[PDB]
């Protein structure tokens, strides 16, 4: 379970994280390299390689994703709002092949986003 | 049916956009302001306001809102990946308050995302 990439170890709690939220579906923890005051990710369980490999069954979880995001969000205090972010292959910037959310906060976004 | 923003004038087709699919869930469109070679939006036919608005019933939902935008993507061509984002708010830089999803390629993508 949780696959073999280093998300995958910390769903299996071989090597910690700051979690910030868990459930039966998915992971929630600090960036340990923040580009925002409040930078964190949120990670399903089940290994999806990346968003292109996801399947139409996927997409329950995949919104889940979003849902504990805007909720992580909200404990943290990001009242002014937020990015959320999901990278795909080479041009997208992924270079961890788990599927994860990044949600960013505590400042303000530019444009274009990257 | 659809809100009253700009994008609730798209979907009501009162406006037309370069629509490059639709379905009874959403539909997705090029953006006018292109921040990449490739830079379109999906967008649910359903108002949310924002990320922050939706609510745990709206899952699949925000889940489809990504499979259209990794097949639309793929429809276009973007082998090498992309990006999608997400804005909530004055920190997000969210300026249309109906939920859409960016998703840009075509280029590498920076980091920070903004
Ligand atoms: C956007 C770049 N590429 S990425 O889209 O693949 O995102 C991966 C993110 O996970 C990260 N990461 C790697 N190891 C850990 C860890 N142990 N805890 C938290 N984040 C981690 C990086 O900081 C990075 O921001
Ligand atoms: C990221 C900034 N803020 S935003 O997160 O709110 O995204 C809104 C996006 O919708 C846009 N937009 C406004 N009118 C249209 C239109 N008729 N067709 C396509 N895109 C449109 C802008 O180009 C912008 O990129």
Redesign the interface.
């Known amino acids: 379970p949780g696959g073999d990439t280093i998300f995958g170890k910390i769903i299996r709690k071989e090597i910690p994280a700051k979690i910030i939220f868990e459930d039966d579906q998915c992971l929630a923890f600090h960036d340990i390299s923040p ?2 005051p409040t930078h964190f990710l949120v990670i399903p369980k089940k290994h999806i390689s990346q ?2 490999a ?1 399947e ?1 069954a ?7 994703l ?2 504990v ?2 909720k992580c ?2 404990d943290l205090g ?1 009242k ?15 270079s961890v092949y788990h599927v994860h959310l ?1 949600v ?11």
Chains 1, 2 share one sequence.
């Not at 996927?58 to 889940?64: F, I, K, N, R």
């Open positions: 580009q925002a968003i292109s996801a139409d996927d997409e329950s979880l995949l919104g889940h979003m849902i995001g805007k969000a909200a990001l002014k709002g937020y990015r959320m972010v999901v990278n795909e292959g080479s041009d997208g910037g992924q990044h960013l906060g505590g400042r303000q976004m530019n444009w274009p986003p990257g």
